[PDB]
Amino acid sequence: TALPAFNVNPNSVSVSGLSSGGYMAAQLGVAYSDVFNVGFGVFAGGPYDCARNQYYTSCMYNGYPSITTPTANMKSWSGNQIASVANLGQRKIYMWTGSSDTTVGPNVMNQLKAQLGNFDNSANVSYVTTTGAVHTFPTDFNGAGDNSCSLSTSPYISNCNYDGAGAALKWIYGSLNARNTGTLSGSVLSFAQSGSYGANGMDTTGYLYVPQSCASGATVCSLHVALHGCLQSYSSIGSRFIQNTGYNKWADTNNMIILYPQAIPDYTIHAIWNGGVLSNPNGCWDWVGWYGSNADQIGGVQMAAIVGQVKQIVSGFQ
Ligand SMILES: *[C@@H]1O[C@H](CO)[C@@H](O[C@@H]2O[C@H](CO)[C@@H](O[C@@H]3O[C@H](CO[C@H]4O[C@H](CO)[C@@H](O)[C@H](O)[C@@H]4O)[C@@H](O)[C@H](O[C@H]4O[C@H](CO)[C@@H](O)[C@H](O)[C@@H]4O)[C@@H]3O)[C@H](O)[C@H]2NC(C)=O)[C@H](O)[C@H]1NC(C)=O
Numbered sequence: 001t002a003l004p005a006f007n008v009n010p011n012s013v014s015v016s017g018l019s020s021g022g023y024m025a026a027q028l029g030v031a032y033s034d035v036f037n038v039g040f041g042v043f044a045g046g047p048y049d050c051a052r053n054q055y056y057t058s059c060m061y062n063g064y065p066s067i068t069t070p071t072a073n074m075k076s077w078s079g080n081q082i083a084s085v086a087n088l089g090q091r092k093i094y095m096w097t098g099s100s101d102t103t104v105g106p107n108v109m110n111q112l113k114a115q116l117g118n119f120d121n122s123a124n125v126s127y128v129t130t131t132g133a134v135h136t137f138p139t140d141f142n143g144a145g146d147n148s149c150s151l152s153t154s155p156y157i158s159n160c161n162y163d164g165a166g167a168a169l170k171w172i173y174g175s176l177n178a179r180n181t182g183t184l185s186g187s188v189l190s191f192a193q194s195g196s197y198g199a200n201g202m203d204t205t206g207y208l209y210v211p212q213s214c215a216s217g218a219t220v221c222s223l224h225v226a227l228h229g230c231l232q233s234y235s236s237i238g239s240r241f242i243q244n245t246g247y248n249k250w251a252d253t254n255n256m257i258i259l260y261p262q263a264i265p266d267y268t269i270h271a272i273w274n275g276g277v278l279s280n281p282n283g284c285w286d287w288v289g290w291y292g293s294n295a296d297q298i299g300g301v302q303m304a305a306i307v308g309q310v311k312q313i314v315s316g317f318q
Contacts, residue, residue, distance in 0.1 A: 030085075043229075055274050
């Protein structure tokens with residue numbers, strides 16, 4: 001099915017994600033700060049350009065990645081390979097980690113905090129820590145199939161007694177109507193991630209949750225892009241990220257569409273920025289350069305595809 005155009009204001013776009021989806025949220029937020037012009041959210045991700053000049057495992061497992069060059073590159077690329085970093089001073093940025101995350105980790109997120117500290121006033125950056133939470137998406141309900149917030153295992157979505165989706169949306173957008181406490185009003189559309197909407201490393205189908213208010217075209221909506229993490233693509237866990245992460249109940253009472261782009265497991269070995277070659281068996285978003293030297297720059301194929309999806313959705317603005 002073709003990705004529809006909706007009555008969404010192009011000035012109301014943001015993105016967030018977990019894991020490699022968190023990394024990608026920041027890559028989009030930085031490289032395309034003009035497109036994601038409200039802000040972005042990072043759950044258990046890491047520094048922009050973290051893995052370009054140091055090996056990816058140094059950007060994981062609660063290690064201490066360097067941000068010297070990554071920060072320098074942001075300064076250097078501003079206005080060319082990425083949108084003006086001045087934009088970032090005018091963005092709401094949400095950050096979250098579990099204190100017991102040993103997959104990415106507080107130390108990694110601390111480095112992202114420091115990096116962004118060079119481009120956005122602390123007042124606009126919220127960095128929340130849930131004590132005891134492991135690498136997992138934090139929600140405050142028992143989604144079907146959820147793993148314990150104390151055990152990092154598939155589907156990496158938990159009841160951590162913390163509404164992470166709500167927190168991120170409220171930090172990015174400000175005051176929101178109370179989340180829907182009943183059945184959702186909308187549907188979960190599928191669309192073809194093909195042509196300009198698709199790319200290497202991406203599934204051929206994406207999804208989006210569309211509240212009844214946004215479907216009719218009679219109401220101007222906003223757009224939030226939510227990016228699953230590694231081992232969280234549709235191929236791995238089906239619709240569990242779409243359904244169990246808690247974005248939809250907020251979208252539903254706040255005239256918001258939630259777009260859910262899908263990556264896919266990729267067992268082909270590719271040259272990456274640093275450390276030689278690597279396949280992408282876990283279906284992560286590209287934060288290491290699997291599909292291009294420009295993965296976190298304007299033109300990066302996955303970012304270009306997601307931005308394409310965004311432009312299509314907002315093309316229906318009335
Ligand atoms: C990211 O975080 C930063 C830091 O908190 C935010 O930036 C501040 O934003 C507020 C509100 O927009 C600014 O407040 C305005 O300050 C003006 C004076 O600015 C002078 O001084 C600052 C340094 O203190 C210089 O940077 C600036 O160039 C000026 O020299 C006031 O004149 C404003 O008041 C007038 O406008 C308001 C609104 O219309 C009216 O209500 C008033 O009556 C009056 O007419 C206002 O108080 C503040 O200056 C900003 N500080 C910074 C960092 O420069 C970002 O907004 C935030 N990102 C976002 C947008 O979310």
